[PDB]
Amino acid sequence: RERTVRLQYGSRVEAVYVLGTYLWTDVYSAAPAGAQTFSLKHSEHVWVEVVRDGEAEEVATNGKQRWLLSPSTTLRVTMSQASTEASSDKVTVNYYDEEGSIPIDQAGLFLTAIEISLDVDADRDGVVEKNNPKKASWTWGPEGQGAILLVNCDRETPWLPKEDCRDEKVYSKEDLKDMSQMILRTKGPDRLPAGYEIVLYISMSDSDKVGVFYVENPQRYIHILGRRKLYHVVKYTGGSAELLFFVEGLCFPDEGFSGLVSIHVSLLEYMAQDIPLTPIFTDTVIFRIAPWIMTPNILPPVSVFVLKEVKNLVEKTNCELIQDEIEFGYIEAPHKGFPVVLDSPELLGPDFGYVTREPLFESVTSLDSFGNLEVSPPVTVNGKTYPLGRILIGSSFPLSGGRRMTKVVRDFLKAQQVQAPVELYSDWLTVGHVDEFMSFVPIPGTKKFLLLMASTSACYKLFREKQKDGHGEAIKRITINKILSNESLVQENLYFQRCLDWNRDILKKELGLTEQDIIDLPALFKMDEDHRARAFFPNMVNMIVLDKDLGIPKPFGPQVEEECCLEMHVRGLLEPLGLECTFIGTNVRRKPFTFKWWHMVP
Amino acid sequence: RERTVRLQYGSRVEAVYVLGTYLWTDVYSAAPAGAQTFSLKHSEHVWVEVVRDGEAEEVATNGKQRWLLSPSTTLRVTMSQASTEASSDKVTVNYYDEEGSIPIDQAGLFLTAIEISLDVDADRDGVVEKNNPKKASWTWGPEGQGAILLVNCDRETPWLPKEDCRDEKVYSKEDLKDMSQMILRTKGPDRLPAGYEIVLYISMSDSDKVGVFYVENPQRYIHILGRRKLYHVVKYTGGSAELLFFVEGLCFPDEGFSGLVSIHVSLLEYMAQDIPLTPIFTDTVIFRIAPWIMTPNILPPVSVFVLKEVKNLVEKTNCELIQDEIEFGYIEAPHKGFPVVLDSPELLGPDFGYVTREPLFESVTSLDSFGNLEVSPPVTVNGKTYPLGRILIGSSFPLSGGRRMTKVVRDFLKAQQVQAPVELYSDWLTVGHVDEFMSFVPIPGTKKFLLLMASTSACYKLFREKQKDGHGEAIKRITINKILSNESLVQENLYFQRCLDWNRDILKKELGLTEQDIIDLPALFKMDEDHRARAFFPNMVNMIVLDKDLGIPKPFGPQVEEECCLEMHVRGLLEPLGLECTFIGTNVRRKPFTFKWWHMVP
């Protein structure tokens, strides 16, 4: 920051100097008529250079030296410590005529040096460091830097109809733990010279994305910037001082909002009461509002929201106790984080947040329900790494006039960025959800997961062996022989295997999977009036994954032995990998990724 | 592209194979009840591998070999040249039971290999190369790649009320020179197997950004994709074939449109007449729509739009013959480019294009007029390079309730990206334009330019020397002595010098300038009723820059000699750098940067 401060003909000019800047001072155009030359004195804590045509040249406090007055001869003025009274530090310039060794005129510059810094935790360790030089940027990765801000979308105070960020008030110091800290640090004399004030400010646009709070009597809570407050004039305190503000996020990254926001402080010179002039200094900090993050099946379960055997299966973990209403995610900053639940178009408590997106022109379908919303385990895809996974959403083809999740949920999910969503084809299903045909399961040593796919061809292959084994009479009276000889039903399932393979191909491509990673599970569909699939027997892939325990729907199909040839087959596949199958809607809150989302690389 | 193609129990499956992909074929789940093992034959141009648990293993066309039937035993099928009749190439699989050395059943795969490529000039040399592997991306810089598309914002046909891109019709082959070429290249037998078609398509959203044209009888011009045409079914021609399409841009990069657009081709399998199934293949090309670019003063003039001495000054260049209505820019692709004029809220000819942006809710001010719109010479700013310069726009401070150029022109200018706009402070001026206080001028050997700034302090410094020289009577009867002793007027100009220095500081910072690069020109302002500045004498910095000839307003102030102490002073500064001053609204169309905008680096 090089800033212009001209000397004024015959006058003494008072200026405030902010440490970290330097002044360029025109001496020439202040010089009286007929001067040929100037000297200068300057005080201890002012560094002064004289500068002709690039050629810098420092000067002592006391020298009697003269130079030749030219427009190419200017000064550069620095100061290296704040002032303890106003003025005191100074630079004075003498102008001497052709001979005359007494100055004809003089011009001065009376400086008060102050330090002003607007500080945040840009290095992301939870401590608000002193003027991080990257605080005005935001970059990704471990070596990256820039401060993070949560949406205050929980509720500290239960009497309250809405989430904290919904008002412009704070009713509890518990709240401030959800907020990011920003400290205005100043260092100067005991009052500002006349006609200066310090003003925090934000843009009209950011004014619905942030709220800033001052803690008075640290106690009362003052809303200074935010909704309908774009600026706040700050009381300067002298000497070394710190003001503490608390910043809350109000909106998630979304269509038309990247999640970056700015807060500024200006030292504004005035010409009067009102008549503001120009900022003589500005400092800026950036916050990135932290995205909403979903949790996959490979992540350890903490609590299962659910009659009888759901409870009994969960006693083998240390979990507590519709899938279509709710998706559990979280939000995380270096300081704080907490579960936040997305709501399909009120567990709203302390440290349990809430988002919805309601359509406006558009209307909801079955594809909006959050069984149509899943996320992979972490993956690498041609080198790019997805440490938090990829969100998966069932769709229809774009020209097919079929169904689609609302744009407003879709844009929301895209806007979060860190789980780079992938669209699948679920609209061949009557309900239309990705959870009807695919699931992930961890392999309990690793680090490594499996994709489970429904497969009609595996089902026909299984039955043709059973009919061969003579279990064709194994059972409105449904036997294998009965199904196998149903030609019409066979066609439908060839068409459904086609839909399943389309998705198989997307999933492999976008999650970097191979056939090694995929288990096909036998499954069978009947075509409804719309030509869409609905399950024929209980849909086994549509399970609960409580670690290594799998809560798999009970098939009850054409059976043999004292159990079933489907429960034997599915047990045969999963159990030899580590996984304990229990055969029996639910919805499991999980442990966050230990992986911090801000370390993610572009 | 790995794609799924299952064998079908007992059946022969016909498939189309697109070169560049590979198939994964499940053999297991097709195998009859009781098989233990399979062999396979395959034709010459089919490459087949057998794959157990990762372990690939190629197989000959004729071998009698058996393998053990398992779900982990699949095939991988490739083909390396197109087919000349349908089927012909094939893979057949034999299934043998426990002993029996004659196959019990068999399943086949009858492949027709075709080549389909949607091709563009992604390497940016004007020739449409064969399947550039980066054609589906767009990257910046010299080593960067991705195809470029002009907005067709000129007019080939003058009877027409609007610019070409405004309809969905082409009335002249001249037009196609403004368009980008895209070639669907196919290679296959003489007909497609039954139930396949090729479909070009675009998104609803891109459908108002692109128009695509087919030249029939190469002649008639067919609109295939664009406004209200999202898809086009293409006639396959057999053998080695090329279809040529022409693509026109319709909209400039803008708020909410990055300037990237996509066009796709799918091979779509059908189950019937209608009943489309799934794309078995998709190829995608990306275009970046080329931005609108402004031209600075250091660039050579081609024609001056203007009573008497404007004409006489221009005869010293080889130029042809309000500044507030119009800004000359251009647009450039590797193939084509042409001047386009931005219109403040009809030189619309062949190779002379047009854009406007009209506000909607907002209304115009003086700051909308394009004297409030300039651009620097190329600059480097802390390493970042601005090879085309930076657009400069006069503004007011954000909290000041002052004037501002319309958001819609501002967003438009930002959206173009390559001249990263900078806002200045012009609202202290009655009119409010950047051209009232600053100009650039080339230094005629280089490569190097100067910033000229209006300066009230230089003016007072000049007069104080004239009054000293006793020219205080040099001249409603205005003399130097008269001005100097006007105290009220002195104050106003101290305040205006303050506004000028604010801008000086922005300009230095954002154009990486130093005092070395700046000439202050003497200037004087009177404060109007709104406290805003209007010039006192003719505003000299507000000049025409026709190379080394400067067309400088004639000052006519307090004079001496047979001319003026202001025309002597300004001549004294400029002429010793190379520049021929002529003292005398205009608007000069210039030579584009030789620098291609796509080579610019992020």
Ligand SMILES: CCN(CC)C(=O)c1cc(-c2cc(N(C)C3CCN(C(=O)c4ccc5c(c4)nc(C)n5-c4ccccc4)CC3)nc(NCC3(CC(=O)NC)CCCCC3)n2)ccc1F
């Ligand atoms: C170019 C690819 N692309 C861009 C990425 C797409 O967006 C895309 C679009 C479609 C699609 C499907 C569709 N339809 C009507 C579906 C058929 C399958 N669906 C069924 O309802 C269905 C499913 C199975 C059945 C049954 C109907 N009837 C029978 C008898 N079966 C059956 C099948 C097997 C066994 C037993 C029964 C669901 C809707 N209609 C249209 N129309 C758009 C079109 C113009 C047009 O024709 N408009 C009326 C024609 C296709 C060309 C683009 C222009 N597109 C399909 C795949 C796609 F990739």
Ligand SMILES: CCN(CC)C(=O)c1cc(-c2cc(N(C)C3CCN(C(=O)c4ccc5c(c4)nc(C)n5-c4ccccc4)CC3)nc(NCC3(CC(=O)NC)CCCCC3)n2)ccc1F
């Ligand atoms: C914090 C910095 N910032 C964020 C980046 C800004 O956007 C910013 C805002 C202003 C600004 C100017 C302004 N005004 C009224 C201008 C005074 C200069 N202008 C004149 O019209 C003008 C100029 C010269 C004159 C004369 C009036 N009257 C006289 C006598 N002179 C004069 C001066 C020298 C010689 C002779 C005459 C033009 C408008 N009014 C308000 N109001 C906003 C505010 C609330 C408020 O007071 N609202 C009513 C107060 C400032 C604090 C933020 C809240 N802001 C100025 C600089 C800024 F950088």
Ligand SMILES: [Ca+2]
């Ligand atoms: Ca820190």
Ligand SMILES: [Ca+2]
């Ligand atoms: Ca609140």
Ligand SMILES: [Ca+2]
């Ligand atoms: Ca809270």
Ligand SMILES: [Ca+2]
């Ligand atoms: Ca909380």
Ligand SMILES: [Ca+2]
């Ligand atoms: Ca879900």
Ligand SMILES: [Ca+2]
């Ligand atoms: Ca090329």
Ligand SMILES: [Ca+2]
């Ligand atoms: Ca047209």
Ligand SMILES: [Ca+2]
């Ligand atoms: Ca044209």
Ligand SMILES: [Ca+2]
């Ligand atoms: Ca043209």
Ligand SMILES: [Ca+2]
């Ligand atoms: Ca202009």
